[PDB]
Amino acid sequence: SLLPVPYTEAASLSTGSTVTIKGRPLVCFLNEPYLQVDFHTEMKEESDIVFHFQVCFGRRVVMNSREYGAWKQQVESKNMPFQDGQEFELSISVLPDKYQVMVNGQSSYTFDHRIKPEAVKMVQVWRDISLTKFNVSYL
Amino acid sequence: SLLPVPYTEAASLSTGSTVTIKGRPLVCFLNEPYLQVDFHTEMKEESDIVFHFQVCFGRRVVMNSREYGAWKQQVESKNMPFQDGQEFELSISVLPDKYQVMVNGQSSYTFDHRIKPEAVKMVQVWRDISLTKFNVSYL
Ligand SMILES: OC[C@H]1O[C@@H](O)[C@H](O)[C@H](O)[C@@H]1O
Ligand SMILES: OC[C@H]1O[C@@H](O)[C@H](O)[C@H](O)[C@@H]1O
Ligand SMILES: OC[C@H]1O[C@@H](O)[C@H](O)[C@H](O)[C@@H]1O
Ligand SMILES: OC[C@H]1O[C@@H](O)[C@H](O)[C@H](O)[C@@H]1O
């Protein structure tokens, strides 16, 4: 059954951590639903963001950090492996130098560490999705 | 108590119709929650949009139409009467030539009719809000 959205979970990340999310957009891509995943430095939603991942389904992905309350330099990708109307599996792996983002088992986005992943205390998953699965694992 | 979000209601609009919404953003403005209100030509969410109203709380408002599946020329306002953390009352009045948008009883946005308001069959209210009230009335 469905997890509450927004979904907030305490987390610790290091090299070899994976965050796995299964959900589905609430509406068709023509209506531009969003998905956002934020790796926060505190449990509080207003805390700094080590890794901001925002999908505008059918359009683009932006990634950023929010440091001392201020947004930094946006990275943009037009890569769109998400399929209109379908369930997705998103997995975000912590590599030594970067986050690796897989969608449905395909390498789709990377983002170099601006802040050590050890600074993360919380993950929030929110915007226009239903969520069936959220897991933090380690290998 | 809370109405389901996304919230979809069949509606007929003409000169003197008002759409009144009461809700609150799910999260602080620093996190840029959205509100969207769409006046659709059919019950189907993929149908054309006579009036698209999208708030990025703390940042801006965009208004548009979506005609034969294609988005038209965006109108942008930096007007932001919405208050961080607070309940809002949004009312959208159908005037002869335009929609008048009031926030907490203050005139905030207008948008000239591109399509007669009689073409509207459905209103959808969605994105990062909780909704306590939705009413269509006439004077
Ligand atoms: O560049 C500033 C903007 O960066 C984007 O990546 C964020 O999603 C926010 O919209 C922010 O305001
Ligand atoms: O985000 C940058 C790049 O990351 C890689 O991991 C992906 O395989 C795509 O090639 C993408 O363009
Ligand atoms: O100009 C095209 C864009 O217009 C905006 O007003 C809509 O919200 C959509 O994002 C659309 O894709
Ligand atoms: O949207 C255009 C204008 O609409 C009026 O109704 C409002 O009072 C604001 O002056 C706004 O700038």
From Swiss-Prot, chains A, B:
Name of the protein this chain belongs to: Galectin-10
Site feature (Not glycosylated) residues: N135
Source organism phylogeny: Eukaryota, Metazoa, Chordata, Craniata, Vertebrata
Function of the molecule: Regulates immune responses through the recognition of cell-surface glycans. Essential for the anergy and suppressive function of CD25-positive regulatory T-cells (Treg).
Keywords recorded for this protein, A-Z: Acetylation, Cytoplasm, Lectin
InterPro entries named among the record's database cross-references: ConA-like_dom_sf, Galectin-like, Galectin_CRD
Positions of post-translational N-acetylserine modification: S1
Summary of subunit composition and partner proteins: Interacts with CEL.
Domain Galectin: 5-137
Biological process (GO), any one: regulation of activated T cell proliferation
Tissue expression pattern: Expressed abundantly in the bone marrow. Expressed exclusively by eosinophils and basophils. Not detected in monocytes and neutrophils. Expressed in CD25-positive regulatory T-cells (Treg) (at protein level). Found in intestinal tissue from patients with Celiac disease, expression is directly related to the histological grade of mucosal damage and to the number of eosinophils found in the duodenal lesion (at protein level). Found in sputum of patients with eosinophilic inflammatory diseases such as asthma (at protein level).
Localisation: Cytoplasm, Cytosol; Cytoplasmic granule
Organism field: Homo sapiens
More about this protein: Forms hexagonal bipyramidal crystals, known as Charcot-Leyden crystals, in tissues and secretions from sites of eosinophil-associated inflammation and some myeloid leukemias.
An example molecular function term from Gene Ontology annotations: identical protein binding
Source domain of life: Eukaryota
GO terms under cellular component: collagen-containing extracellular matrix; cytosol
